[PDB]
Amino acid sequence: RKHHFVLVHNAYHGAWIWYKLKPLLESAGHRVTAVELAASGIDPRPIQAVETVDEYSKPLIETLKSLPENEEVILVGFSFGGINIALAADIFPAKIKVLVFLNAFLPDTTHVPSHVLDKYMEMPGGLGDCEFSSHETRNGTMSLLKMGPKFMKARLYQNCPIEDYELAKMLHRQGSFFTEDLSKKEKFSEEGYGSVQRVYVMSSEDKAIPCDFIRWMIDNFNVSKVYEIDGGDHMVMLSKPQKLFDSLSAIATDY
Template sequence: MTQKHFVLVHGSSHGAWCWYKLKPLLESGGHKVTALDLSASGVNPKQLRDLRTLHDYTLPLMELMAALPNGEKVILVGHSFGGINIALAMENFPHKISVAVFLTAFMPDSVHPPSYILDQFNKCTPAETWLDTQFLSCGTPEDPLTSVVFGPQFMSKKLYQMCSPEDIALGGLLIRPSSYFTEDLPKVKKFTNEGYGSVKRVYIICSEDQAITLDFQRWLIENIGVVQAKEIKDADHMAMLSKPQQLCEYLLEIARDE
């Protein structure tokens, strides 16, 4: 197989570190893999208080896409809220992406603003689902921002319930406060068919996800459609940790189709 370039984009509160099992598996197949930290994530030096917009948060990905040589196309993989980040890259750099893979991720459409899918998610997600997660104000009245701080119960019961104790401990040590940018998302223009909509989309379903449930993952797929959907059985929200081998096999299959 011709070498492909995978770009891995983490979800809220996580960082490039969460791909530590998947990255060497893909590289052992002869592929190039870039796992990056979004702003105020992983080891990125920015703090959440420095951010206000989705674009601020996504800037490292946008800079990476802009720096790609002309003619190079990547396979963009977004996990969880990272689906919104890769959608922004798809809108701005559709000619640099061969396929976008949404891994149990929020996947916007091109009819509504990107805030629509989060609104729908919140409508069908009871408040008690969040357990000990904290939503705190870290902005100002003039420039508001709500932070999200995952609690240990939420992580172990909703995100990492099928992961090893070591991976749960790793996540607990490395996660950082994040945000869903609910104040900014309604201001973000809806994505276009000419940009975002022109990139092939594949969705990877995680059947045991307790955060973005199976029903909601299927609703996302029905809402806009994909060229292909694959399902990982017995995978929790953190499939790159709980089912890295199966995830790798699916990504290699997707790459072979390109």
């Protein structure tokens, strides 16, 4: 059978990252919706205009809200999109058969929502030539970030065709992890987010989110299955689009 995949991109990026995967899915007869979150991609809003993670995810929530009733989706969250889908699952858990965490941050149901993001930022190394900034909001300061080209090439796009790195340099935008908003947020519920089925999909060569951090997350909060994509970098939908399709196709079958 065929399913409806809702694809949710990562921060500093947009729906455009799914341009290789979307036709592969649709060509197999699945329906695909590539959500464009706020201040992301060609969204007209600056990131300064998006002060809470809730506003950031609004387009995703809006997509599920207006979903034909009784329809269920495969919700795919890439990277920071993992927080987004957890957010959405806690509102519309019954519109989601399975949550797919693709090289994503996998939040738990026990600590503040920002937990795995904080534990991540505490890792040694820093972030290459990324540019940290701050922004005062109605509710304290919001931490902003824009990636640097060297950081992107070395830790996100190492296995991508050069065209895709170049394309990213032309499209990536300043964004946020909303670590501050998320720290003040009510923890994800077990009745909502917790009740939804969830699997993990990880690239074997993810240099943005270390394999061991990924394992600490899954350890911290179990999933039904863990699929691995051999040779994928962080941007596995650009480096290994076909293998990503194979993974999601296996997921669709299992669920």
